Amino acid sequence: DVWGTISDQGMVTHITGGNFAQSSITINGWLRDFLWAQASQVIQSYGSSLSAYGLFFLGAHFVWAFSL
Amino acid sequence: DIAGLTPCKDSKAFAKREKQSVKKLTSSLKKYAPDSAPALAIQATIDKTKRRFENYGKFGLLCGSDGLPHLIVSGDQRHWGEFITPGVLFLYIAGWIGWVGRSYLIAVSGEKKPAMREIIIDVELASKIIPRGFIWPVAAYREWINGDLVVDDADIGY
Amino acid sequence: ELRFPRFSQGLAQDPTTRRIWFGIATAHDFESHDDITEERLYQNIFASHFGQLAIIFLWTSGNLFHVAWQGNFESWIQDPLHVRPIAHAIWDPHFGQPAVEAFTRGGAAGPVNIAYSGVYQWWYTIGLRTNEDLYTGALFLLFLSTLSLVAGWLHLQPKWKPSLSWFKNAESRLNHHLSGLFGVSSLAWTGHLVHVAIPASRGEYVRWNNFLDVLPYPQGLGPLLTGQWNLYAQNPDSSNHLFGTAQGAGTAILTLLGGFHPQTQSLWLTDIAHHHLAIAFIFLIAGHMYRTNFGIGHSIKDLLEAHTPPGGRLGRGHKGLYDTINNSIHFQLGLALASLGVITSLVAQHMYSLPAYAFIAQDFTTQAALYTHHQYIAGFIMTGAFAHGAIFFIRDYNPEQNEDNVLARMLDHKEAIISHLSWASLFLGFHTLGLYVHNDVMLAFGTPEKQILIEPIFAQWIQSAHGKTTYGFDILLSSTNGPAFNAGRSLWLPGWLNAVNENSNSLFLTIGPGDFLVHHAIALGLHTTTLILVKGALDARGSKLMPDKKDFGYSFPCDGPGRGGTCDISAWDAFYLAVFWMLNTIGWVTFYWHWKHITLWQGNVSQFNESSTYLMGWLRDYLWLNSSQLINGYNPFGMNSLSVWAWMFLFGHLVWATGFMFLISWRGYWQELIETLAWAHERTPLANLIRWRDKPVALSIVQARLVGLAHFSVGYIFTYAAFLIASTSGKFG
Amino acid sequence: LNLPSIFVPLVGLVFPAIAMTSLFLYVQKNKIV
Amino acid sequence: SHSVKIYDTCIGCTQCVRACPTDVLEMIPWDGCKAKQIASAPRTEDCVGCKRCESACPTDFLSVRVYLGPETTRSMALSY
Amino acid sequence: VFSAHFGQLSIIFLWLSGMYFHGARFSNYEAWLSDPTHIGPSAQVVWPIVGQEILNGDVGGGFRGIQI
Ligand code: CLA
Numbered sequence A: 001d002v003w004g005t006i007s008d009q010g011m012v013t014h015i016t017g018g019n020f021a022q023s024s025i026t027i028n029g030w031l032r033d034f035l036w037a038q039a040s041q042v043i044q045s046y047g048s049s050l051s052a053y054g055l056f057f058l059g060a061h062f063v064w065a066f067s068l
Numbered sequence B: 001d002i003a004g005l006t007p008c009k010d011s012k013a014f015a016k017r018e019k020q021s022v023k024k025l026t027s028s029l030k031k032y033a034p035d036s037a038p039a040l041a042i043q044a045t046i047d048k049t050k051r052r053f054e055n056y057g058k059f060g061l062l063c064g065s066d067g068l069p070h071l072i073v074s075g076d077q078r079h080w081g082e083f084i085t086p087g088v089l090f091l092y093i094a095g096w097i098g099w100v101g102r103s104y105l106i107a108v109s110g111e112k113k114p115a116m117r118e119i120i121i122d123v124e125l126a127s128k129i130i131p132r133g134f135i136w137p138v139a140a141y142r143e144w145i146n147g148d149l150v151v152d153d154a155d156i157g158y
Numbered sequence C: 001e002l003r004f005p006r007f008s009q010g011l012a013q014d015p016t017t018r019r020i021w022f023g024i025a026t027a028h029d030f031e032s033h034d035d036i037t038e039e040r041l042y043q044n045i046f047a048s049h050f051g052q053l054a055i056i057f058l059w060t061s062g063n064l065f066h067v068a069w070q071g072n073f074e075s076w077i078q079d080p081l082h083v084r085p086i087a088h089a090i091w092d093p094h095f096g097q098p099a100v101e102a103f104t105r106g107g108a109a110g111p112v113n114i115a116y117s118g119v120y121q122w123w124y125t126i127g128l129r130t131n132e133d134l135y136t137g138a139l140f141l142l143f144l145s146t147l148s149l150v151a152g153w154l155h156l157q158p159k160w161k162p163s164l165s166w167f168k169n170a171e172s173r174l175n176h177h178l179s180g181l182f183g184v185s186s187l188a189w190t191g192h193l194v195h196v197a198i199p200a201s202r203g204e205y206v207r208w209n210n211f212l213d214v215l216p217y218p219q220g221l222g223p224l225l226t227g228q229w230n231l232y233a234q235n236p237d238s239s240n241h242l243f244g245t246a247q248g249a250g251t252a253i254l255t256l257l258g259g260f261h262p263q264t265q266s267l268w269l270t271d272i273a274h275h276h277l278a279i280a281f282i283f284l285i286a287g288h289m290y291r292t293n294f295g296i297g298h299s300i301k302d303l304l305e306a307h308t309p310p311g312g313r314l315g316r317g318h319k320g321l322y323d324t325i326n327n328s329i330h331f332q333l334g335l336a337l338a339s340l341g342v343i344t345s346l347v348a349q350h351m352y353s354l355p356a357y358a359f360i361a362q363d364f365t366t367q368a369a370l371y372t373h374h375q376y377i378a379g380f381i382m383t384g385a386f387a388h389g390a391i392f393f394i395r396d397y398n399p400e401q402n403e404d405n406v407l408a409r410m411l412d413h414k415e416a417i418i419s420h421l422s423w424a425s426l427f428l429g430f431h432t433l434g435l436y437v438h439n440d441v442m443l444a445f446g447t448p449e450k451q452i453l454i455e456p457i458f459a460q461w462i463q464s465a466h467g468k469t470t471y472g473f474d475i476l477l478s479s480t481n482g483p484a485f486n487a488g489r490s491l492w493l494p495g496w497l498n499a500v501n502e503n504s505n506s507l508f509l510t511i512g513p514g515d516f517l518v519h520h521a522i523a524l525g526l527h528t529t530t531l532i533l534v535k536g537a538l539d540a541r542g543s544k545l546m547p548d549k550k551d552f553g554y555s556f557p558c559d560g561p562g563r564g565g566t567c568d569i570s571a572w573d574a575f576y577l578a579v580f581w582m583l584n585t586i587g588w589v590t591f592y593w594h595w596k597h598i599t600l601w602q603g604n605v606s607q608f609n610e611s612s613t614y615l616m617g618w619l620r621d622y623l624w625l626n627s628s629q630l631i632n633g634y635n636p637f638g639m640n641s642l643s644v645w646a647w648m649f650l651f652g653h654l655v656w657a658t659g660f661m662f663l664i665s666w667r668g669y670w671q672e673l674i675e676t677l678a679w680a681h682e683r684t685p686l687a688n689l690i691r692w693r694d695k696p697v698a699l700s701i702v703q704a705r706l707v708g709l710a711h712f713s714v715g716y717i718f719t720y721a722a723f724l725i726a727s728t729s730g731k732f733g
Numbered sequence D: 001l002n003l004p005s006i007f008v009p010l011v012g013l014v015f016p017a018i019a020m021t022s023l024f025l026y027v028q029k030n031k032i033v
Numbered sequence E: 001s002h003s004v005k006i007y008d009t010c011i012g013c014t015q016c017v018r019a020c021p022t023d024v025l026e027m028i029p030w031d032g033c034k035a036k037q038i039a040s041a042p043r044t045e046d047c048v049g050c051k052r053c054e055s056a057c058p059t060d061f062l063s064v065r066v067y068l069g070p071e072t073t074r075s076m077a078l079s080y
Numbered sequence F: 001v002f003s004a005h006f007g008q009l010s011i012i013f014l015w016l017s018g019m020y021f022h023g024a025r026f027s028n029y030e031a032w033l034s035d036p037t038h039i040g041p042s043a044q045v046v047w048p049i050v051g052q053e054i055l056n057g058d059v060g061g062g063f064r065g066i067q068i
């Protein structure tokens, strides 16, 4: 609802395009439109300057499961 | 060749991967001044990449259909450099470390409070025992022969 | 006998809610009941086994009746590749109209469920053709289920109760069960195949009203009696045969072809008939080994007493094991459960590579479901085997009568056994996790050519020995001029070799470095689970920390905070810890199976071959990629037929997590809280006119461990089942 | 007649009521003999 | 009610009696040790099963042992 | 307690000195001063061994490093 870009004519385009109002009212909405959709950047980061974040993503899942 | 594999010096996929990596590096190189530090770093990376591919090609490795090197560990004498010789080196070093540790523990156990010498190392004593790992395979073998390596089952207890 | 439970005075005098819970949990532990004797134990067990048979027959009859009443078996028979079979109709008053529209499928006139158990293919392969046949089968099974209850009631009356010495006649029982239950049943099923199912696979309909007149073979039993048996094989089915019809049909009944039927992609029926005939012969011979009443037969005790190595390295050998086994029912249950678990895994492995039911190989979702289902059942059985084996050491083992035999020496070198198992687990874990992490780092820095990729040379060599030509090895059955190739060249080698070298089926799939890595991970799982269970069993009677453990029984909370603290010290707790590792290992197995097959069925093997060598590949290309349809079963724009599965998916994640609550927080926190609520209720007007009669208390320590593990397991299973079924059926149906 | 419309309520609502009632009255008995 | 037992390795140190929170145990005369006394458990209907007595005992292995049994109002420590 | 609190203050000052020195020596702050909206801030750079130099990403202003 806030962050995004604006054109010369003044048309605001949001990063996720105003999907919070309709999709955040079910658990399936949080699972599909928030975690699954937005995890793409972190899981596609290998081979670029952001690959350290993918490595830490996996390592932190490992430590969490280790605590059990 | 072995298991349907192809030598990496004759693989088209291997050369394709090399060319793709070099092109990806050159695209970044074309963003900076020729004499700037980032350009020199990228050029050094490119030279290192070419050297790596050439050495992999001429060291006799085998490449699969994906175009990546694969290792052979069944005992074939054309690939001992892949597993057997480094394995001998690993065993030699590990035996040295274990042997010097055991000898320190045995030499220190005769004191009044041996535990005090386990949280505070006697460096003077350890510096006489460290060089003796150089011949651990002989010492361990002779100790095994004379029955000094192992404790009898009847004597084991707290 | 005062109140519920009537079988335990100690529980019946308990004034708290703990009376009820525990009353349910100890109902089937007959050995612990008040004033129980040895004979009544066996008799009650016999009655209970009859009950289990009755329930099983009812379950099967219900399946048949519902399929006949509400299914489309007749329609499916005529177009088996494009029609979806129907399990049962849906009548839910909570449904909305869009769901009513979405769940109407398969040509039905109302909402239905699609069946994935595979009963349509099974029942079509054995010769059933109409709904009347299904109705008659359901009624017959209803009769058998009643027979079981009547027999159970009869053998529980004073005139008809077997004595204790009857239940301990080992030789006679072994003879009857080997000869009659295995061999004769196989003979009867072979007869069914010859008289009913094989003719049905050629257009001939044989039923109970005309089976006497029709001959299974034109020349009858003449060749069997005279010995010209080869006449039963000489005219097999053609390679252009259509399964339900007479086009290309043959006349043979017993063959040795091998390979598959080109249309149905399953095993030839004549091969199955000859197989069951030979197996029946082998069991009929096996069932004559032991002595009952006729002066011939071996003696089991005398067999055990004789096999003793003369060097003394095995002590006194197998002396005394006959009574040790025959006087302990837990020992027997452990042996049986171990054997059944092994063969459950063998069934799962052999049914995916060598299908036996017509048109089931093309039904991808059904095959996935069957493999996963039977592997999870096998895992649970394997854990139970070690559980009852540990129970043996506490309850029934007698040291004096086992002096210096193999069973005692096992207890004698437990430190060596456990330490070497620990070493194996450490080695596998360190080096396998290290290789995966090295490959992940190489991928991250953009240098995939620096990975460590070990070719699975030994497995490829064995595949070559079995006939595969992919890897260029020339050995045994993969060579042209050898004794092994020559000996079978004319019997079964052509069809077998044609099947193995076809790369569309799942017979000896091509393997690479990813397969190497995942197999060493599976080995890690097996070794660690075995370590946990074995340590539980061998330390059951005591250790240095608790030298008198056997006095306290199989399951008890702890021994208090003294001597450093003693949480989770009983054998029951070792079982509890091992179940987690079992679930982990079976998860790895089923993940690997599913991903390899899903890339096979899409024609994209290189995806698996390249992504499987590092763990981010597993996370991204298997889990994340294959969820997209599943999580859109319902959304802000509408719903489709996957909605139930989507719902189930979330249901699973919930139950799993709820289990964590019982596993992490322990009892003393909850009891203090409960006291306050009791105070509050006793003080509230208009509500203190109502009184409880069982005083509420927090759950016990062992009970909490059990409840937490149960929520964990249920959530595990439901989540994976939803993902597997939705992902496969969304792509293929 | 539509048999599901009659039998689904009986198995899902009435039979559980009777069974739970009987079990509650059984576990509360002061003495069984 | 729980069961509590005393074995003849007792040295009569009296620590278990001092540790008990509901007065289950007591000391009685004996002639088998240098302290001329031994422990006893005459009031086990008031035992809660805490095992402080086992924590206090110095011999190896223990000389006082507690076996948990059927639960009562007194043994579950219910004030309601 | 008094002495230990003095020690904590010493450690915090070390942390701030490190931050300012790394900003002065290994950053693109001066370039960022002239184009804040298009340049990504960066004040950490890595040595070139075992291929980790890929983490020196293209942040702009003739500088390669890790974005902060
Ligand atoms: C020939 C005589 C005979 C026969 C037929 C039986 C039969 C039976 N006895 Mg036995 N029994 C006998 C004599 C016999 N008994 C005698 C003489 C004694 C006294 C010494 C006993 C004492 C005795 C006791 C004390 C008990 C039994 C029990 C049983 C039952 C075991 C459970 C069962 O159904 O397993 C069925 C097993 C099979 C069909 C064989 C195993 C097949 C395996 C799993 C492989 C399957 C492969 C196949 C291709 C798979 C197809 C799958 C399908 C979906 C397509 C069974 C009905 C038990 C019972 O439950 O009683 C009610 C029991 O407790 N018997």
Ligand code: CLA
Binding pocket: C024, C025, C026, C027, C028, C029, C030, C380, C381, C383, C384, C385, C387, C388, C391, C554, C555, C572, C575, C706, C710, C714
């Ligand atoms: C042929 C199979 C067989 C047989 C005849 C027995 C028989 C026996 N077992 Mg053994 N056991 C088996 C298989 C078998 N076991 C298997 C496969 C396992 C491994 C899981 C075990 C593990 C095991 C343990 C650990 C113990 C026994 C014990 C017992 C005794 C009965 C205890 C009782 O009354 O529980 C009463 C039953 C319950 C309280 C029900 C428990 C149900 C669990 C928690 C899961 C239920 C979840 C539910 C389905 C959720 C549905 C949700 C829905 C939304 C889908 C008895 C001697 C006990 C014993 O002898 O102790 C000395 C004991 O402690 N067994």
Ligand code: CLA
Binding pocket: B086, B087, B088, B090, B091, B094, B095, B097, B098, B099, C423, C426, C427, C428, C430
């Ligand atoms: C970069 C490469 C690398 C790395 C980081 C490691 C790292 C490790 N290796 Mg490994 N290993 C490697 C390559 C590597 N290995 C290779 C190439 C081989 C093939 C030869 C092996 C074979 C190997 C074995 C066989 C074992 C390890 C073990 C270990 C672990 C303990 C080492 C230790 O404590 O030594 C310090 C030394 C000691 C504590 C003394 C005892 C152990 C060493 C190995 C001496 C053994 C002497 C004995 C006579 C040799 C023959 C043993 C026989 C079973 C084959 C450690 C995590 C050990 C392990 O996982 O244990 C559970 C282990 O047993 N490695």
Ligand code: CLA
Binding pocket: A062, A065, A066, A067, A068, C422, C425, C426, C427, C428, C429, C430, C433, C528, C531, C532, C577, C580, C581
């Ligand atoms: C992801 C979770 C996880 C992991 C990694 C482990 C790991 C292990 N478990 Mg555990 N376990 C878990 C979950 C896990 N468990 C759960 C949920 C349960 C159910 C309660 C159990 C129950 C359980 C039991 C009952 C047993 C084990 C055992 C084991 C060991 C098996 C052998 C092995 O692989 O050794 C290799 C070791 C490892 C893979 C551990 C990690 C090693 C790291 C990567 C080395 C490098 C460290 C790094 C340099 C340190 C930096 C940090 C810091 C200094 C800055 C191992 C230590 C068995 C055991 O002890 O066998 C001997 C055993 O008996 N586990």
Ligand SMILES: CC1=C(/C=C/C(C)=C/C=C/C(C)=C/C=C/C=C(C)/C=C/C=C(C)/C=C/C2=C(C)CCCC2(C)C)C(C)(C)CCC1
Binding pocket: C331, C334, C335, C338, C342, C385, C386, C388, C389, C390, C392, C537
């Ligand atoms: C603790 C205990 C217990 C338990 C136990 C158990 C649980 C066990 C298990 C075990 C197991 C689980 C085992 C397994 C095994 C297996 C084996 C041993 C196998 C083998 C195989 C073979 C040998 C094969 C071969 C071949 C091939 C491969 C190919 C073709 C040909 C032939 C066939 C030759 C009991 C009860 C006793 C009691 C006491 C205690």
Ligand code: SF4
Binding pocket: E004, E019, E020, E021, E022, E023, E024, E025, E046, E047, E048, E049, E050, E051, E052, E053, E054, E066
């Ligand atoms: S368990 Fe607790 S209450 Fe019982 S005798 Fe020991 S110290 Fe006393």
Ligand code: SF4
Binding pocket: E009, E010, E011, E012, E013, E014, E015, E016, E017, E038, E039, E056, E057, E058, E059, E063, E064
């Ligand atoms: S603490 Fe142990 S040794 Fe001391 S009096 Fe009590 S039982 Fe005896």
